[PDB]
Design an enzyme around this catalytic site. Structure first.
Site, PDB file in Angstrom:
ATOM      1  CB  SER A  48     -19.980  56.724  57.530  1.00 15.24           C
ATOM      2  OG  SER A  48     -20.004  57.254  56.127  1.00 15.24           O
ATOM      3  CE  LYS A  51     -21.998  60.849  58.326  1.00 15.05           C
ATOM      4  NZ  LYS A  51     -21.175  59.881  57.445  1.00 15.05           N
ATOM      5  CB  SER A  96     -23.943  57.086  55.381  1.00 11.65           C
ATOM      6  OG  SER A  96     -24.021  56.076  56.412  1.00 11.65           O
ATOM      7  NE  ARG A 228     -22.038  47.731  54.655  1.00 13.11           N
ATOM      8  CZ  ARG A 228     -22.441  48.914  54.775  1.00 13.11           C
ATOM      9  NH1 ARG A 228     -21.534  49.733  55.049  1.00 13.11           N
ATOM     10  NH2 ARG A 228     -24.088  49.128  54.351  1.00 13.11           N
TER      11      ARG A 228
HETATM   12  O1  LIG Z   1     -23.033  52.985  54.154  1.00 11.74           O
HETATM   13  C1  LIG Z   1     -23.141  52.959  53.017  1.00 11.74           C
HETATM   14  O2  LIG Z   1     -24.375  51.864  52.444  1.00 11.74           O
HETATM   15  C2  LIG Z   1     -22.728  54.049  51.926  1.00 11.74           C
HETATM   16  C3  LIG Z   1     -21.731  54.942  52.295  1.00 11.74           C
HETATM   17  C4  LIG Z   1     -21.894  55.517  50.959  1.00 11.74           C
HETATM   18  C5  LIG Z   1     -20.858  56.862  51.466  1.00 11.74           C
HETATM   19  C6  LIG Z   1     -19.752  56.602  52.641  1.00 11.74           C
HETATM   20  C7  LIG Z   1     -19.559  57.865  52.506  1.00 11.74           C
HETATM   21  N1  LIG Z   1     -18.605  58.503  51.742  1.00 11.74           N
HETATM   22  C8  LIG Z   1     -19.194  58.137  50.701  1.00 11.74           C
HETATM   23  C9  LIG Z   1     -19.820  57.335  50.751  1.00 11.74           C
HETATM   24  C10 LIG Z   1     -22.150  54.890  50.030  1.00 11.74           C
HETATM   25  C11 LIG Z   1     -22.961  54.142  49.739  1.00 11.74           C
HETATM   26  C12 LIG Z   1     -23.755  54.089  47.921  1.00 11.74           C
HETATM   27  C13 LIG Z   1     -24.639  52.733  47.589  1.00 11.74           C
HETATM   28  C14 LIG Z   1     -24.769  52.465  46.858  1.00 11.74           C
HETATM   29  N2  LIG Z   1     -24.697  53.266  45.329  1.00 11.74           N
HETATM   30  C15 LIG Z   1     -22.644  53.613  46.036  1.00 11.74           C
HETATM   31  C16 LIG Z   1     -22.441  54.369  47.027  1.00 11.74           C
HETATM   32  C17 LIG Z   1     -22.929  52.992  50.826  1.00 11.74           C
END
Ligand SMILES: O=C(O)c1cc(-c2ccncc2)cc(-c2ccncc2)c1
Ligand SMILES: O=C(O)c1cc(-c2ccncc2)cc(-c2ccncc2)c1
Ligand SMILES: [Cl-]
Lengths: 243, 243
Positions: A48, A51, A96, A228
């Site tokens: 992401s 983006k 995101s 992060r």
């Molecule tokens: O950047 C993030 O913080 C984030 C990004 C994704 C995601 C980005 C792109 N394709 C798929 C998922 C998913 C999640 C996430 C948070 C909690 N539990 C599960 C997943 C967090």
């Protein structure tokens, strides 16, 4: 002279039994700093963090009119609750929201997407795969130092899109601001192809300098995503960039 | 009802042995709220809240090229330490650097300043006094409701300057940002004409609404200046706008 390795920052990763890289660039001094020179140059899927260029391209081509245009939820319930609602460019970057950017990418199309990533000198410039998923599971790869090179162009309005597009994307990147600093950044989380990693790329604005940053770290489960920002901020604190 | 008076907010002023007004405008609902309808419509010197229109005019006329242009300190020691340094538009706004903005006003000149304030429908539009100080001790006056009217135009890029000028000034107004809200705003402190008052005007960006605000309060000494933001935030918390 131009790049200095500071292995003391590894303590912020081993603290959490984790592994990764933080890369910093002092814009005034034109000097870079990292805990791992090799990994700073290792290229990964952007996930992401893509983006940022996707937004630029969508705005410059008129796929997105402005930061207020609403992209309606398509009615499909996905596993991330914040995706199951209407969004604009600002909230789509904040949460995101992949499906919104997949629509952008389809409207941009393969030819224009490829040409614009070449114009941006972005990573390996390779969009092989699905036009609406190559940044998650296709052929595009970018390193932390390449992320910084790209972000510096954006900061200076030097990318080959309009000044307006660049200003809107930097607005949408706004993450944190207080009396001490402004952070404009984008998170990423690459899970479709190994190795699973987390990203945070952007910059810290100070009164009289800008510090660009790009970090990635091994991310075997979503439970560690907060590291992060937390590890990056420990590095920023160690180097006296933020309080 | 378009306008509602909520006198319970008076407690936030009384707590501090103070008096003043907060005006809120819910953009989605087109409804306003205040603790004092009379004072909401009383006009005061804008003092440093004038840096919003002054910035816009300076940018649109090319007096200021962009937000990076450096205005070098003139080397005259003043009693605010942060003024005794070089500034750009961002830091000049942040530190309310009067002497930078006085030079802007001289370069704009009386005729253009007057014409632009009329085009902006800004307050009483009266620049009588000295062109380099009229917002501090000349004839210009603006009320809290008039500040909201002006700010709403700025938010919507509807002022009669370029979109670029408006985006740059809104960037320069950035005051606070976190995962819950963004505040873009400008403080002011009027001491040269009675009553001495403090201002805070701006807006709060949420995911799916904007709340405009304008407050002023009696300010007999500089010791109370932090109450401008503190009281505003207590009202915002009471109304469940921010946590
Ligand atoms: O950047 C993030 O913080 C984030 C990004 C994704 C995601 C980005 C792109 N394709 C798929 C998922 C998913 C999640 C996430 C948070 C909690 N539990 C599960 C997943 C967090
Ligand atoms: O918050 C304010 O409204 C304000 C703050 C400062 C200031 C900024 C940074 N370090 C200290 C003080 C200075 C002034 C000011 C405005 C007009 N004439 C004189 C002074 C007003
Ligand atoms: Cl911004």
């Amino acid at each position: 002279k131009e790049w200095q390795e500071n292995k003391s920052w590894n303590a912020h990763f081993t603290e959490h039994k984790s592994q990764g890289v933080v890369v910093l660039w002092n814009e005034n001094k034109q000097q870079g700093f990292t805990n791992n020179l090799k990994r700073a140059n290792q290229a990964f899927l952007p996930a992401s963090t893509f983006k940022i260029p996707n937004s630029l391209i969508a705005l410059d081509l008129g796929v997105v009119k402005d930061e207020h245009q609403v992209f309606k939820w398509d009615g499909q319930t996905r596993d991330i609750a914040t995706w199951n609602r209407d969004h604009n460019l600002i909230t789509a970057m904040k949460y995101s929201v992949v499906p919104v950017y997949q629509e952008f990418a389809r409207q941009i199309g393969e030819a224009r997407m490829s040409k614009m990533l070449h114009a941006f000198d972005y990573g390996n410039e390779d969009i092989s795969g699905n036009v609406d998923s190559f940044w998650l599971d296709g052929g595009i790869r970018i390193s932390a130092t390449e992320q910084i090179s790209f972000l510096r162009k954006l900061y200076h309005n030097k990318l080959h899109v309009s000044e307006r597009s660049q200003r809107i994307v930097k607005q949408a990147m706004l993450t944190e601001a207080n009396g001490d600093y402004i952070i404009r950044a984008k998170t990423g989380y690459s899970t479709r192809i190994e190795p699973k990693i987390g990203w945070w790329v952007g910059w810290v604005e100070l009164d009289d300098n800008v510090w660009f940053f790009a970090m990635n770290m091994d991310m075997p489960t979503s439970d560690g995503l907060g590291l992060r920002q937390a590890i990056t901020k420990e590095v920023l604190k160690q180097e006296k960039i933020i309080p």
